[PDB]
Design goal:
Blueprint: H1 2-9, H2 12-24, E1 39-41, E2 44-46, E3 50-52, H3 63-69, E4 73-79, E5 92-95, E6 100-103, H4 112-120, H5 123-131, E7 136-140, H6 149-160, E8 166-170, H7 185-200, E9 209-214, H8 220-233, E10 237-240, E11 261-264, H9 268-281, E12 288-291, H10 297-306, E13 310-313, H11 315-320, H12 323-338, H13 344-347
Parallel strand pairs: 3-4, 3-13, 4-7, 7-8, 8-9, 9-10, 10-12, 12-13
Antiparallel strand pairs: 1-2, 5-6, 6-11
The structure holds flavin mononucleotide, ligand AVQ, orotic acid and chloride ion (CL).
Orotic acid binds near residues 55, 103, 242 and 261.
Amino acid sequence: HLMPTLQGLLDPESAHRLAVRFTSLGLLARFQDSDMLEVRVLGHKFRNPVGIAAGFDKHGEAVDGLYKMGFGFVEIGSVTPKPQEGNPRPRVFRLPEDQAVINRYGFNSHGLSVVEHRLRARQQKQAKLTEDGLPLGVNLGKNKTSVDAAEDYAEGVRVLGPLADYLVVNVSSPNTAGLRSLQGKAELRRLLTKVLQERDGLRRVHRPAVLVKIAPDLTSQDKEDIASVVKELGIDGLIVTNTTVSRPAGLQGALRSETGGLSGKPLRDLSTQTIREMYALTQGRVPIIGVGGVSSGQDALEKIRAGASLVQLYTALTFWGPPVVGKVKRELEALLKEQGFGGVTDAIGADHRR
Ligand SMILES: Cc1cc2nc3c(=O)[nH]c(=O)nc-3n(C[C@H](O)[C@H](O)[C@H](O)COP(=O)(O)O)c2cc1C
Ligand SMILES: Cc1cc(O)n2nc(SCc3cc(Cl)ccc3Cl)nc2n1
Ligand SMILES: O=C(O)c1cc(=O)[nH]c(=O)[nH]1
Ligand SMILES: [Cl-]
């Protein structure tokens, strides 16, 4: 009621900005996480497997409010090396009839320096949160006018790697020209070699896991190549998936033909299937964070059974608000019991074993 009014009254970008402000100020979880929901992966304990996806808190302003909302882990970003404004407005669109969003933000970012200082101000608070099962991820992007993509990512590793439990090499935004070509075998191998070199140069207690975030629009060859490179280099994990440049048949929203990445329900099963493929291609040995269209416990469990160790959501929050977090968790716990799993861990990749 208070949300859909403010959102019927505000364009989506204004609604987002207000949501970040409200969350950051702690104006918002009764659900107490069961032991069944704990997952150990990426060198950390996660008190529950439901995280906030990149894009909600691009600049690291609302991290504590997000844990208060009940997220088991928080991912901020994408952060670019230099500040940049992103695309001109309007650049985000609701498709309410589809429970979907289309965005073309183009990596609006306060930049590494601003985010560094913001995280440093709460660095020991985060260390305690991480030890308590509430890790922090930092998602790295590249500036629009950058003439060396790998150096942009390297800079991100150097500056924010020491403040993160995991880093994400985001090579799958549909809204930065040329970016998704970095998912190609040769480009990815070169980029990730550099990224891992830089990460390995950080002092041990400041050395994050490194994950690569991939698109839902990849060819079979692209997926096979990514799997090969991830295994060759010892990449720590995959985030599967970013938004889709596809427009599935059946979309009803008036704004369905806006340029950008599509998120929410129409992406859900395309993302699940991409998780399934990547888990198989990596022999279940590479942790996957599953994302795209999660709005229920069933949605979460489907991705977990397909191979995700953790899941994330964003678009569901924009429709259902903060209560969706607890809802997903409570539903997930109930389904795990119904399906005879002792916990989340037992369900990871379960579809591949039946
Ligand atoms: C408004 C918006 C902005 C986003 N910005 C980013 C971003 O900066 N970096 C990133 O890796 N993913 C970004 N994403 C993608 C989400 O992290 C996620 O992969 C995708 O939206 C699918 O999950 P969902 O269906 O739960 O929203 C963004 C998504 C939305 C809706
Ligand atoms: C791009 C976009 C649009 C949007 O309505 N939302 N909503 C959220 S979180 C939901 C929310 C909305 C308002 Cl208006 C106030 C508080 C909260 Cl938590 N994030 C968003 N991101
Ligand atoms: O900044 C954006 O446009 C953006 C980045 C990204 O990775 N994914 C997305 O959907 N939007
Ligand atoms: Cl440091």
